[PDB]
Coordinates of C-alpha atoms in Angstrom, one line a residue:
Chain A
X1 CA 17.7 -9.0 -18.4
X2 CA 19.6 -5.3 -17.9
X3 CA 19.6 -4.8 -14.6
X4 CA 18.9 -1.3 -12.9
X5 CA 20.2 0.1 -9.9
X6 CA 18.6 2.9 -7.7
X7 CA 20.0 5.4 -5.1
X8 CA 19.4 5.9 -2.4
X9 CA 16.7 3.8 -0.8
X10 CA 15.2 6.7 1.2
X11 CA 15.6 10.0 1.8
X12 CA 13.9 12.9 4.2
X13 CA 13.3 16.3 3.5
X14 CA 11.3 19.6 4.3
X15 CA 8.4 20.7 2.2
X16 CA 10.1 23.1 0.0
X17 CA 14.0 21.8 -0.1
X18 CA 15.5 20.4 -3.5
X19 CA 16.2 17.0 -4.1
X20 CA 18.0 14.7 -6.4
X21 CA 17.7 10.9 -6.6
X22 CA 19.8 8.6 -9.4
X23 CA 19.7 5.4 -11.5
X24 CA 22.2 3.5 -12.9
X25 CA 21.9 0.8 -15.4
X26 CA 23.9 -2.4 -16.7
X27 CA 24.1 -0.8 -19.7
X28 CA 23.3 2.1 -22.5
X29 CA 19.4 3.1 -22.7
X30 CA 20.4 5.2 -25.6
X31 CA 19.2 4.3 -29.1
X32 CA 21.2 4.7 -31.9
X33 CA 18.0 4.6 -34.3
X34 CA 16.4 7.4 -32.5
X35 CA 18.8 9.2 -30.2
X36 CA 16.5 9.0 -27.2
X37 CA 17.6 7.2 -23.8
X38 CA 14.8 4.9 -23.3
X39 CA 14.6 5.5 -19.4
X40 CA 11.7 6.7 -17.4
X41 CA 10.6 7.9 -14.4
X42 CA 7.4 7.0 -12.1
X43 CA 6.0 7.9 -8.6
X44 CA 3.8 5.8 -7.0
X45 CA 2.1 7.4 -3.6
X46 CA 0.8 5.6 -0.7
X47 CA -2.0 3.1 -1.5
X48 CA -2.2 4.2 -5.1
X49 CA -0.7 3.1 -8.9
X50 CA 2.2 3.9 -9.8
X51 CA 2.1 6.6 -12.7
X52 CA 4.4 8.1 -15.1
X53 CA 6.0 11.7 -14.8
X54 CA 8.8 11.7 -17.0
X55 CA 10.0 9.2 -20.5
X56 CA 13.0 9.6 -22.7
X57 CA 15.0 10.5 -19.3
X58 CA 13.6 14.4 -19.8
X59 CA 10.7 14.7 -20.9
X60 CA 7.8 15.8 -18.5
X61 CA 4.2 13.4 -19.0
X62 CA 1.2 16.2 -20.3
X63 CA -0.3 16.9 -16.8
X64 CA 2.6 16.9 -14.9
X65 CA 4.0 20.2 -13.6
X66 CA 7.6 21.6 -14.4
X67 CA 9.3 21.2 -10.5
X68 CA 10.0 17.6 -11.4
X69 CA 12.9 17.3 -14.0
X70 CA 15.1 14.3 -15.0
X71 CA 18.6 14.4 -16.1
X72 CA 21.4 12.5 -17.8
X73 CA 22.2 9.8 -20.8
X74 CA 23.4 6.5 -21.2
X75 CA 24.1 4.7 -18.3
X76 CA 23.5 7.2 -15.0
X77 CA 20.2 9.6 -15.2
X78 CA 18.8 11.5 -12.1
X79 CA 15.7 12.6 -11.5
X80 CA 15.3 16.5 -9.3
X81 CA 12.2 18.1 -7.2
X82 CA 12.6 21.6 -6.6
X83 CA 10.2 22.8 -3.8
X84 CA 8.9 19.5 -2.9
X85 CA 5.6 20.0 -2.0
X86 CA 4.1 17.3 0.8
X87 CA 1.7 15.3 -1.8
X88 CA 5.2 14.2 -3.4
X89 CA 5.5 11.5 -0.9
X90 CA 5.8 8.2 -2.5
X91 CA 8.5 6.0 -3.6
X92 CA 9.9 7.3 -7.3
X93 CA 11.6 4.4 -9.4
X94 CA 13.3 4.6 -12.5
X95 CA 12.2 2.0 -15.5
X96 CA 14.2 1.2 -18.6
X97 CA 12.1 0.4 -22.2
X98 CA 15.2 0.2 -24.5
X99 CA 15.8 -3.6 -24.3
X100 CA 12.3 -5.6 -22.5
X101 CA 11.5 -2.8 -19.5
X102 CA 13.0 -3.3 -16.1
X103 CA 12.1 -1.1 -13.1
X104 CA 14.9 0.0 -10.7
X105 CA 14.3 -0.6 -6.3
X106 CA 12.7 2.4 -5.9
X107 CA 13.9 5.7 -3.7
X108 CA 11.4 6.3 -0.9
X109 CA 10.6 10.4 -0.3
X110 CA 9.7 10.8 3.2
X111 CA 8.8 14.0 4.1
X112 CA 10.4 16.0 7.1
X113 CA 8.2 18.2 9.2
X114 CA 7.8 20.0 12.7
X115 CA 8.5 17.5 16.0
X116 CA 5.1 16.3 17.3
X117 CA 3.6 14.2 20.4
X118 CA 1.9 11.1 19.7
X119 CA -2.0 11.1 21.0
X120 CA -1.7 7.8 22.5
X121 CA -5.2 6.0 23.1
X122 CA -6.2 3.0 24.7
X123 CA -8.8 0.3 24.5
X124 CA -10.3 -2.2 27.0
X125 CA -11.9 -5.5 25.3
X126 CA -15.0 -5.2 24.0
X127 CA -17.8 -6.9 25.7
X128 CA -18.5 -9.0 22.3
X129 CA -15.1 -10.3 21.9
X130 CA -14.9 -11.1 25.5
X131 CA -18.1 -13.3 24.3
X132 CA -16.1 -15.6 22.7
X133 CA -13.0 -15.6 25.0
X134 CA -10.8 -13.7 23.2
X135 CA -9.4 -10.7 24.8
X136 CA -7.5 -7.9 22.7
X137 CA -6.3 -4.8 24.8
X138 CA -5.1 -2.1 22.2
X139 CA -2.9 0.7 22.1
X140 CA -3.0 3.7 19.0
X141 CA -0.3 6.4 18.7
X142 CA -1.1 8.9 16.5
X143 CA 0.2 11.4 14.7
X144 CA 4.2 11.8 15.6
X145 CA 7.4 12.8 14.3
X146 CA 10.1 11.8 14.0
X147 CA 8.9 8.0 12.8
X148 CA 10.8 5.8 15.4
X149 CA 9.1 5.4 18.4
X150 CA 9.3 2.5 20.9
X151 CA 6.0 0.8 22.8
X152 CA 5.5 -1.1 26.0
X153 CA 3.0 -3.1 27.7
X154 CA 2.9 -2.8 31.8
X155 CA 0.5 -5.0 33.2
X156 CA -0.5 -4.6 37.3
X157 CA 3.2 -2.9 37.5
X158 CA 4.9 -6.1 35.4
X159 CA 6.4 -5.1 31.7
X160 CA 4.7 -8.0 29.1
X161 CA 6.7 -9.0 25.8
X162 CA 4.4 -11.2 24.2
X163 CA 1.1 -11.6 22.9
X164 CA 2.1 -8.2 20.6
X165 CA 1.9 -7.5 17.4
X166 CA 2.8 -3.9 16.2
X167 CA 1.7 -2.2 13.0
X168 CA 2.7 1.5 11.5
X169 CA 1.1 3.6 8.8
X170 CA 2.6 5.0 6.2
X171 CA 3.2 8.6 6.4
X172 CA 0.1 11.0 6.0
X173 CA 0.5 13.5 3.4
X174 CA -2.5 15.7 5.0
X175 CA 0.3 16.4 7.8
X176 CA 3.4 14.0 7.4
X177 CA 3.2 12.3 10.6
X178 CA 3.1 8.7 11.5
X179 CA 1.1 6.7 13.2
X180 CA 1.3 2.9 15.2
X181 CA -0.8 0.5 16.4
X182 CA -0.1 -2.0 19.1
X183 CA -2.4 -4.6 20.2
X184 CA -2.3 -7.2 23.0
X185 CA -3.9 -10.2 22.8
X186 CA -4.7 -12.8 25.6
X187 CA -7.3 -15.3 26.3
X188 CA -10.3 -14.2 28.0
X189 CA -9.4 -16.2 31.6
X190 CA -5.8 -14.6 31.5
X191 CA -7.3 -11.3 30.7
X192 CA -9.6 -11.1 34.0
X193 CA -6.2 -12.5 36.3
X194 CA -5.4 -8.7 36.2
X195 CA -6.7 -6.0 37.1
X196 CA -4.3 -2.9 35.6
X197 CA -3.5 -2.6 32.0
X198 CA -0.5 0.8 30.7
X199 CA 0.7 1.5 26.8
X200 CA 3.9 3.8 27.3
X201 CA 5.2 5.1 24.5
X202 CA 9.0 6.5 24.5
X203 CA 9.3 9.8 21.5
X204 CA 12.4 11.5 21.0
X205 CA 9.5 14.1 22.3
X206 CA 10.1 13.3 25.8
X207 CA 12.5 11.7 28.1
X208 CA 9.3 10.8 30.3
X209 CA 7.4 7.4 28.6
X210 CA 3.9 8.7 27.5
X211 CA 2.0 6.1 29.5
X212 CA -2.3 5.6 29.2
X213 CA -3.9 2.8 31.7
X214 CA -7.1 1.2 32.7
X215 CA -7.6 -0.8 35.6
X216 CA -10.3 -3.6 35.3
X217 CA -12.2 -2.6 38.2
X218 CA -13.4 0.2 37.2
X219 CA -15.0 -1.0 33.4
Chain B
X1 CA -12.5 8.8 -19.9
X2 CA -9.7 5.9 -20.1
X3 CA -10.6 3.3 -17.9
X4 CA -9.0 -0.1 -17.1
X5 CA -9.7 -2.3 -14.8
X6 CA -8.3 -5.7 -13.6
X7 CA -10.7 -8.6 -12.8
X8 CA -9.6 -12.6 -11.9
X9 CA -7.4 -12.3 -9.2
X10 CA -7.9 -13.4 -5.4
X11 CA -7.0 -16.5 -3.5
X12 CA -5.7 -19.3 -4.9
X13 CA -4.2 -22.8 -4.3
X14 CA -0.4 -23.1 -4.9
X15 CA 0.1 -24.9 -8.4
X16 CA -3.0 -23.4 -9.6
X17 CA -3.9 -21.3 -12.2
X18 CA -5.3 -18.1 -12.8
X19 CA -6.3 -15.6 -16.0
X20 CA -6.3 -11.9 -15.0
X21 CA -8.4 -9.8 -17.3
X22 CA -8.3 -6.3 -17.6
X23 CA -11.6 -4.6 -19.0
X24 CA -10.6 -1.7 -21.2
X25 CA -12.7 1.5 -22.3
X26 CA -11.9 5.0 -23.9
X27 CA -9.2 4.7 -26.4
X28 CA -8.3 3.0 -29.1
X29 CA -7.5 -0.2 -28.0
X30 CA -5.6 -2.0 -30.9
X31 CA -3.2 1.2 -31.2
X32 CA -1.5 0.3 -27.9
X33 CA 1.0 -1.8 -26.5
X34 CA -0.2 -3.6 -22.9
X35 CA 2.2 -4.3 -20.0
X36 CA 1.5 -6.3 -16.9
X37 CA 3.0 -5.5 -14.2
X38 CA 3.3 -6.9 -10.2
X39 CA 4.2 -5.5 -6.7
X40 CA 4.4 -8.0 -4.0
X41 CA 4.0 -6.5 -0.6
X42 CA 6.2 -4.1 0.4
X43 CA 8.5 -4.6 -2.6
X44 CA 9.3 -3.0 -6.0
X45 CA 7.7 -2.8 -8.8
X46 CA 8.4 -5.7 -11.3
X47 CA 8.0 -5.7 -15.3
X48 CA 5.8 -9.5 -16.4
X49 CA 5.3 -8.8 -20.1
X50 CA 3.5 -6.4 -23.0
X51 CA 1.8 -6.9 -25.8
X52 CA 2.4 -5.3 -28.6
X53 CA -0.2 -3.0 -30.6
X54 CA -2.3 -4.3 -34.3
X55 CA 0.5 -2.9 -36.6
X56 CA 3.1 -5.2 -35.2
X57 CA 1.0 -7.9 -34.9
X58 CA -0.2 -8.0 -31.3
X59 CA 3.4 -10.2 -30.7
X60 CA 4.4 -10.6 -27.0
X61 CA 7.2 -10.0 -25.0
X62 CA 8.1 -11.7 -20.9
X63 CA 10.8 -10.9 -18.2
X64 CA 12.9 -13.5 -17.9
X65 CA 11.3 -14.5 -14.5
X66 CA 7.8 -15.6 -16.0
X67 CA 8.7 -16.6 -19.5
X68 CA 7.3 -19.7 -20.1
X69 CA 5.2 -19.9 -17.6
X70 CA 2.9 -16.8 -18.2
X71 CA 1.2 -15.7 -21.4
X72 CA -0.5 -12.6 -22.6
X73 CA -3.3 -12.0 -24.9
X74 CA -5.9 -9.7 -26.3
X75 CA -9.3 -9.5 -27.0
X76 CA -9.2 -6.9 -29.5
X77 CA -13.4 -7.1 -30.5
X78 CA -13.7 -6.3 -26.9
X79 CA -10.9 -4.4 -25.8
X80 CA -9.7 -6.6 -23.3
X81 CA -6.1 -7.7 -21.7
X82 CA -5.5 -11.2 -20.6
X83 CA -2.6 -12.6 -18.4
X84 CA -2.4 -16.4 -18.2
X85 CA -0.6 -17.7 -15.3
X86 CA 0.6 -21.5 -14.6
X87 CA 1.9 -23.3 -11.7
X88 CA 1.6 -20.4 -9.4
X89 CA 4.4 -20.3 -6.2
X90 CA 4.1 -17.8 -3.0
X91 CA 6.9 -15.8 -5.1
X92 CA 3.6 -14.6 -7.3
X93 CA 1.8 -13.1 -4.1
X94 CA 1.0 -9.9 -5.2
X95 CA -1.2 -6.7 -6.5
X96 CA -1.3 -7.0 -10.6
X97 CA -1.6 -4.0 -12.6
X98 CA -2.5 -3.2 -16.6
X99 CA -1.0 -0.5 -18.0
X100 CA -1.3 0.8 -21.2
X101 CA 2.3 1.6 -23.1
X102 CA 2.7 3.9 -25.8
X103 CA 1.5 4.4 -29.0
X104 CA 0.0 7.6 -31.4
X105 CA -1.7 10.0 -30.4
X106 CA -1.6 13.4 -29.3
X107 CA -1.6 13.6 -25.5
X108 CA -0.4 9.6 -21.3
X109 CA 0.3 6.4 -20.2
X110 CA -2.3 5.2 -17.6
X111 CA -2.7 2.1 -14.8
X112 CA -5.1 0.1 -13.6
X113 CA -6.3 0.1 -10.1
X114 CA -4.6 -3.4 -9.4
X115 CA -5.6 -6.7 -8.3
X116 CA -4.2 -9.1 -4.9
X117 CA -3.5 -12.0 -5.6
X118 CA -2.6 -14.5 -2.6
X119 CA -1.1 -18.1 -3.2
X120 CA -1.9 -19.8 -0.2
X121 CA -3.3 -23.1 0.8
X122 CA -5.4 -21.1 3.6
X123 CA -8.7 -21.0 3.4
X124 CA -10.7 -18.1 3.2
X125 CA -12.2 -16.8 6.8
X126 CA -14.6 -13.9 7.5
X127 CA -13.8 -11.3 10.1
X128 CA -14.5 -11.0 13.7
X129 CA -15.6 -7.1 13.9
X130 CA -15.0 -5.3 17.1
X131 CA -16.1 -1.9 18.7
X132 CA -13.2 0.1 20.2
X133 CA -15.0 2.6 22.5
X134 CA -13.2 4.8 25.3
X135 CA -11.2 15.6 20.5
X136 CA -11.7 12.4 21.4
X137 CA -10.5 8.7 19.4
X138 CA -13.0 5.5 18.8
X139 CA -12.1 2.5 16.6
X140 CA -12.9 -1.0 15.4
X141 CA -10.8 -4.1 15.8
X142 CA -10.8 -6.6 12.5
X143 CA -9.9 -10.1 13.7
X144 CA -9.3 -13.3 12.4
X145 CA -9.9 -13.3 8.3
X146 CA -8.4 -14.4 5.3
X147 CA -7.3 -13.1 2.7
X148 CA -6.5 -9.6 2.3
X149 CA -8.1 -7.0 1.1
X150 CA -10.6 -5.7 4.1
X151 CA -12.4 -2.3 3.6
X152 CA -13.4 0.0 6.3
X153 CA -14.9 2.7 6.4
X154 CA -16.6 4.9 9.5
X155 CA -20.5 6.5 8.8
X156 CA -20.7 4.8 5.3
X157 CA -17.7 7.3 4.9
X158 CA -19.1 10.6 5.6
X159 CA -16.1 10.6 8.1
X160 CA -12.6 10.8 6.3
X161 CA -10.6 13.4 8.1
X162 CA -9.3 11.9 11.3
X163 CA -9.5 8.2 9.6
X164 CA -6.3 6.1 10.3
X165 CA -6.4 2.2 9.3
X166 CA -3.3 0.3 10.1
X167 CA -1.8 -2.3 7.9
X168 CA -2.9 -6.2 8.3
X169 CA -0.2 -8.4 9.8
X170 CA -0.9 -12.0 9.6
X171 CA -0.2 -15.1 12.0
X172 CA -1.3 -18.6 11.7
X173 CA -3.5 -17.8 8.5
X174 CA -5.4 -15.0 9.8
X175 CA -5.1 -11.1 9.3
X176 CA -5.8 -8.9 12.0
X177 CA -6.1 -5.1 11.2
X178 CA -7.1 -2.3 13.4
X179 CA -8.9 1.5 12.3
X180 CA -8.6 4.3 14.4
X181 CA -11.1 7.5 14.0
X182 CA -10.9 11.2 15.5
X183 CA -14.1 13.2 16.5
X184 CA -14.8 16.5 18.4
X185 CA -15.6 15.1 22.3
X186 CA -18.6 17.1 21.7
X187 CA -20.6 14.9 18.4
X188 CA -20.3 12.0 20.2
X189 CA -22.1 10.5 21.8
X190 CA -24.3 12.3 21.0
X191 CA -24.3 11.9 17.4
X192 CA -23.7 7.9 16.6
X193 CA -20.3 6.4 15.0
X194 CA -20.5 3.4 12.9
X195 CA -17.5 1.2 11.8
X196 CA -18.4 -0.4 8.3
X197 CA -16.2 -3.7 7.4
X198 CA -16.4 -4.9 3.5
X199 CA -14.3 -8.5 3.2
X200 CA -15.2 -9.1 -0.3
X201 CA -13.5 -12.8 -0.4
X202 CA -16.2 -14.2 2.3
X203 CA -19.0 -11.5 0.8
X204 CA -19.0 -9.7 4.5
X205 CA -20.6 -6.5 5.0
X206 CA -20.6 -5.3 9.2
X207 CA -21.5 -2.5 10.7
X208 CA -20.3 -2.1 14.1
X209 CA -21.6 1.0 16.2
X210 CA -19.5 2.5 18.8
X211 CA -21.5 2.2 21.8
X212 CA -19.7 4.3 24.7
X213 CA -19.1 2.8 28.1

């Protein structure tokens, strides 16, 4: 039961800046037997396993290169990326093995990059789910920075709340932008009520909504 | 090559039980300590348990959260990893990973790939598939399954680049999902795109061309 402490949660910076991230724990990871601190480090990417780049607070896993370094004794240790690279992104958390092993909260690396537009797209129901009188209308916006972004549904000139549901990737390494999907769902009969269906999407990239339609009559 | 693996997961019942194996090749097994450890969704990583290696006496250690409750063992003929697990609450929702620890030789610690495990009284479902037709941007609509994981893939994955595939969100017991895909205007349609959907739970394989119009 030591408890350890990560910080902070997140942080956002340019391929090639240096950064620094820290643990704290309830108490000393340093063996008296061996003079080691029994603290380690490991990154864990998007959609993958976490693995280890760095045991006995400083030293590096065989493998790993020489950029990533780890720091300290005791209680506080800090791990360091000089030129962070964009495949870094993932969320780095501390682990103690000198009493049981505890892993720390985790510090999530976002990476910061260039200001881009989403490409917003958008998608009638398709004949086959109409079939079954469902009726999904969706919305993708792809590829942006900076992450927030905010979505809304117009439907024949009338703003619609509900029936959404909102999902967001996780950041691409390939070019560290986000993306967001946005889907609308109605029945079938409500669905063919209306004829004019508009995503806009507000970006720090624009004081103008980015706004994609279809009208009904023309399917 | 090392390999591990994690098998014996999935969907179950809350109060049941499970025993998650992990299948282990390319290394002396007996040498190593064995940890389990868990991720729910979205959260941190959390340390279960190891298992020590054969010159302690393969003796077994838990967090305080499972201890009691979960067990560890070895199959050391076959180089296999157990993790027993009794009474099971929504709190043990998660992926599952092996990892190997520490101990001998010369050169890493490795990790399994991970296994979901959902406690839910849902029932599994399979998915509705939908085309999502119009550099231009097809996708495909995955509606109304349970539980996670779904795979999809577009042209038995011979297209990758341009791939985006949102996270599931569930409501009332069913997991929608949505998968974009990016082309040049000018392949399609004239060369065919085809949305592949894998939801192992219900043994569903789809294919779902995007037919333009």
């Amino acid at each position: 039961d030591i408890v350890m402490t990560q910080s902070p949660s997140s942080l956002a910076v340019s391929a090639g800046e240096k950064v620094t991230m820290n643990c704290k724990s309830s108490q000393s990871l340093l063996n008296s037997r061996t003079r080691k601190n029994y603290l380690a480090w490991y990154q864990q990417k998007p959609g993958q396993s976490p693995k280890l780049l760095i045991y006995w607070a400083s030293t590096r896993e065989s493998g790993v290169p020489d950029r990533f370094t780890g720091s300290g004794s005791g209680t506080d240790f800090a791990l360091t990326i000089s030129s962070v690279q964009a495949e870094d992104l993932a969320v780095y958390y501390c682990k103690q093995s000198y009493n049981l092993r505890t892993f720390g909260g985790g510090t999530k690396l976002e990476i910061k990059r260039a200001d881009a537009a989403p490409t917003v797209s958008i998608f009638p129901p398709s004949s086959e789910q109409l079939t079954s009188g469902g009726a999904s209308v969706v919305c993708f916006l792809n590829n942006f920075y900076p992450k927030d972004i905010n979505v809304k549904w117009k439907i024949d000139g009338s703003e619609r709340q509900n029936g959404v549901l909102n999902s967001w990737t996780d950041q691409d390494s390939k070019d560290s932008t986000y993306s967001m999907s946005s889907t609308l769902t109605l029945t079938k009969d409500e669905y063919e009520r209306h004829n004019s269906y508009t995503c806009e999407a507000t970006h720090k990239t624009s004081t103008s909504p980015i706004v994609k339609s279809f009208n009904r009559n023309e399917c | 090559e090392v390999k591990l693996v994690e098998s014996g997961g999935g969907l179950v019942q809350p109060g049941g039980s499970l025993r998650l194996a992990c299948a282990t090749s390319g290394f002396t097994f007996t040498d190593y300590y064995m940890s389990w450890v868990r991720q729910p969704p979205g959260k941190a990583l959390e340390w279960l348990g190891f298992i020590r290696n054969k010159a302690k006496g393969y003796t077994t250690e838990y967090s305080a959260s499972v201890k009691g409750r979960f067990t560890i063992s070895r199959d050391n003929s076959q180089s296999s990893l157990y993790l027993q697990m009794n009474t099971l609450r929504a709190e043990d929702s998660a992926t599952y990973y092996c990892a190997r620890d520490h101990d001998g030789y010369y050169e890493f610690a490795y990790w399994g790939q991970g296994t979901l495990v959902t406690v839910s009284a849902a029932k599994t479902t399979p998915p509705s598939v939908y085309p999502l037709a119009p550099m231009v941007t097809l996708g495909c609509l995955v509606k109304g399954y349970f539980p996670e994981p779904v795979t999809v893939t577009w042209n038995s994955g011979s297209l990758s680049s341009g791939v985006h595939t949102f996270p599931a969100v569930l409501q009332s017991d069913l997991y929608t999902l949505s998968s974009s895909v990016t082309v040049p205007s000018s392949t399609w349609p004239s060369e065919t795109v085809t949305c592949n959907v894998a939801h192992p739970a219900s043994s569903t394989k789809v294919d779902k061309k995007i037919v333009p119009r």
